[PDB]
């Protein structure tokens with residue numbers, strides 16, 4: 702539950 | 707979750 | 712969740 | 717959740 | 722939730 | 727979140 | 732959130 | 737939130 | 742919130 | 747998150 | 752239920 | 757997350 | 762339920 | 767439930 | 772995560 | 777999970 | 782998991 | 787549940 | 792796991 | 797559940 | 802569950 | 807017709 | 812017709 | 817028709 | 822038609 | 827439809 | 832429809 | 837659709 | 842579809 | 847449809 | 852589809 | 857469809 | 862038609 | 867599909 | 872479809 | 877499919 | 882049609 | 887399909 | 892498929 | 897059709 | 902399909 | 907398949 706672009 | 711399109 | 716389109 | 721279009 | 726169009 | 731199309 | 736189209 | 741079209 | 746079109 | 751198409 | 756842009 | 761197409 | 766852009 | 771871009 | 776196509 | 781498309 | 786497409 | 791690009 | 796496509 | 801690119 | 806490129 | 811966003 | 816995003 | 821993103 | 826991303 | 831995208 | 836996008 | 841572009 | 846581009 | 851993408 | 856590009 | 861991608 | 866990514 | 871490119 | 876990719 | 881490229 | 886990635 | 891890849 | 896390249 | 901990657 | 906790869 | 911390359 703973590704996407705940092 | 708983390709969904710990026 | 713996190714949804715980005 | 718978080719929805720971004 | 723958070724909806725942004 | 728759910729996205730239909 | 733839900734998005735239909 | 738829900739968005740229909 | 743709901744948005745119909 | 748789920749994305750349908 | 753959080754979207755900050 | 758799940759993505760259908 | 763978190764999207765920060 | 768986290769997407770930071 | 773699962774991706775269908 | 778983390779889904780990026 | 783971590784899915785990147 | 788982690789993708790950082 | 793870690794899936795990269 | 798970790799992909800860092 | 803680890804791919805770093 | 808079409809839908810944008 | 813088409814859908815964008 | 818088509819879907820983008 | 823087609824799907825992109 | 828014809829899509830010029 | 833023809834879409835010029 | 838038919839685009840005469 | 843048919844594009845006359 | 848014809849897609850010019 | 853048929854593209855006359 | 858013809859896809860020019 | 863086709864799917865990209 | 868048929869591309870006349 | 873014909874795909875020009 | 878048939879590409880006339 | 883085809884799938885890319 | 888014909889794929890030009 | 893048939894490519895006329 | 898084909899699959900790439 | 903014919904694949905030109 | 908048949909490539910006329």
Ligand SMILES: *C(=O)Cc1ccc(-c2ccc(-c3ccc(CC(*)=O)cc3)s2)cc1
Pocket residue numbers: 702703707708767777778787788
């Ligand atoms: C009880 O109160 C303690 C406790 C511990 C953990 C949880 C969680 C439920 C779901 C979690 C989670 C969501 C997303 C992500 C990032 C993407 O996968 C990680 C973990 S933690 C609830 C209660």
Ligand SMILES: *C(=O)Cc1ccc(-c2ccc(-c3ccc(CC(*)=O)cc3)s2)cc1
Pocket residue numbers: 702707708712713747757767777
């Ligand atoms: C009691 O407090 C223990 C507990 C732990 C976790 C949960 C959850 C229920 C649903 C969860 C969830 C929903 C969506 C997402 C977004 C993408 O995956 C993550 C986690 S955690 C309930 C009770």
Ligand SMILES: *C(=O)Cc1ccc(-c2ccc(-c3ccc(CC(*)=O)cc3)s2)cc1
Pocket residue numbers: 707712713717718727747762767
């Ligand atoms: C009691 O307090 C334990 C508990 C823990 C979690 C929950 C949840 C119910 C629904 C949840 C949820 C909904 C949407 C999202 C957005 C994307 O996933 C995340 C989590 S948590 C209820 C009771």
Ligand SMILES: *C(=O)Cc1ccc(-c2ccc(-c3ccc(CC(*)=O)cc3)s2)cc1
Pocket residue numbers: 712717718722723727732752762
């Ligand atoms: C009692 O207090 C425990 C508890 C915990 C959570 C809930 C929830 C019910 C609905 C929730 C929710 C709705 C929408 C969103 C937006 C996107 O997901 C998130 C969470 S939490 C009720 C009782």
Ligand SMILES: *C(=O)Cc1ccc(-c2ccc(-c3ccc(CC(*)=O)cc3)s2)cc1
Pocket residue numbers: 717722723732737752
């Ligand atoms: C009692 O107090 C425990 C409890 C907890 C949560 C709720 C909720 C009912 C509806 C909720 C909700 C509605 C809309 C949104 C917006 C997007 O999701 C979020 C949460 S919380 C009731 C009782």
Ligand SMILES: *C(=O)Cc1ccc(-c2ccc(-c3ccc(CC(*)=O)cc3)s2)cc1
Pocket residue numbers: 717718722723752753762763
């Ligand atoms: C009882 O009184 C304690 C309690 C705890 C939590 C809740 C909640 C219900 C819904 C919640 C929620 C809505 C939106 C978001 C952001 C987007 O998902 C997060 C949590 S908290 C009610 C009562």
Ligand SMILES: *C(=O)Cc1ccc(-c2ccc(-c3ccc(CC(*)=O)cc3)s2)cc1
Pocket residue numbers: 712713717718752762763767768
């Ligand atoms: C009881 O009162 C304690 C408690 C704990 C947690 C909750 C929650 C329900 C839903 C939650 C949630 C919503 C959105 C997000 C971000 C996107 O997924 C995270 C968590 S917390 C309610 C009561």
Ligand SMILES: *C(=O)Cc1ccc(-c2ccc(-c3ccc(CC(*)=O)cc3)s2)cc1
Pocket residue numbers: 702703707708712713762767768
């Ligand atoms: C009880 O009150 C303790 C407790 C612990 C955890 C939760 C949660 C439910 C859902 C959670 C969650 C939502 C989104 C994310 C980010 C994306 O996946 C992580 C965790 S925490 C509720 C109550």
Ligand SMILES: *C(=O)Cc1ccc(-c2ccc(-c3ccc(CC(*)=O)cc3)s2)cc1
Pocket residue numbers: 702707708757772777778782787
């Ligand atoms: C009690 O607190 C122990 C516990 C631990 C974990 C959970 C979870 C339920 C759902 C989870 C989850 C949902 C979505 C994602 C996003 C991608 O995978 C990650 C994790 S954790 C509940 C209770």
Ligand SMILES: *C(=O)Cc1ccc(-c2ccc(-c3ccc(CC(*)=O)cc3)s2)cc1
Pocket residue numbers: 772777778782783787792797
């Ligand atoms: C109790 O607290 C022990 C425990 C440990 C782990 C879990 C989990 C349930 C679901 C998990 C998970 C979901 C999605 C992903 C994303 C990709 O894989 C990772 C992990 S952990 C529940 C209870």
Ligand SMILES: *C(=O)Cc1ccc(-c2ccc(-c3ccc(CC(*)=O)cc3)s2)cc1
Pocket residue numbers: 782783792793797802
């Ligand atoms: C109790 O705390 C011991 C324990 C240990 C591990 C787990 C897990 C459940 C699911 C796991 C997992 C899901 C997805 C991925 C992504 C790719 O593989 C990794 C690990 S760990 C539960 C309880």
Ligand SMILES: *C(=O)Cc1ccc(-c2ccc(-c3ccc(CC(*)=O)cc3)s2)cc1
Pocket residue numbers: 782783787792793797798802803
């Ligand atoms: C109990 O509370 C202790 C405990 C220990 C470990 C876990 C985990 C469940 C799933 C985990 C996990 C998810 C993703 C990854 C990266 C990709 O595979 C590694 C581990 S840890 C829960 C509770």
Ligand SMILES: *C(=O)Cc1ccc(-c2ccc(-c3ccc(CC(*)=O)cc3)s2)cc1
Pocket residue numbers: 792793797802803
């Ligand atoms: C109990 O709380 C101690 C404990 C120890 C280990 C775990 C794990 C479950 C899954 C793990 C894992 C996920 C991904 C990777 C990288 C790719 O394979 C390594 C390990 S650790 C949970 C609880």
Ligand SMILES: *C(=O)Cc1ccc(-c2ccc(-c3ccc(CC(*)=O)cc3)s2)cc1
Pocket residue numbers: 817827828832837838842847848
């Ligand atoms: C029984 O199947 C009746 C039937 C047949 C075909 C259809 C169609 C719905 C949408 C179609 C379409 C839209 C756009 C394009 C390309 C753009 O011009 C091709 C086809 S055919 C509905 C009911």
Ligand SMILES: *C(=O)Cc1ccc(-c2ccc(-c3ccc(CC(*)=O)cc3)s2)cc1
Pocket residue numbers: 812827828832833837
């Ligand atoms: C039985 O299926 C009756 C029937 C057949 C076709 C349709 C259609 C609905 C929408 C159509 C369409 C819209 C746009 C385009 C491209 C733009 O000009 C092609 C087709 S056909 C409805 C009922």
Ligand SMILES: *C(=O)Cc1ccc(-c2ccc(-c3ccc(CC(*)=O)cc3)s2)cc1
Pocket residue numbers: 827828832833837838842843
């Ligand atoms: C029963 O299935 C007979 C039948 C056949 C085809 C259709 C069509 C639906 C949409 C069509 C279309 C619209 C536009 C264009 C070019 C763009 O302007 C091509 C095709 S044909 C309905 C019923």
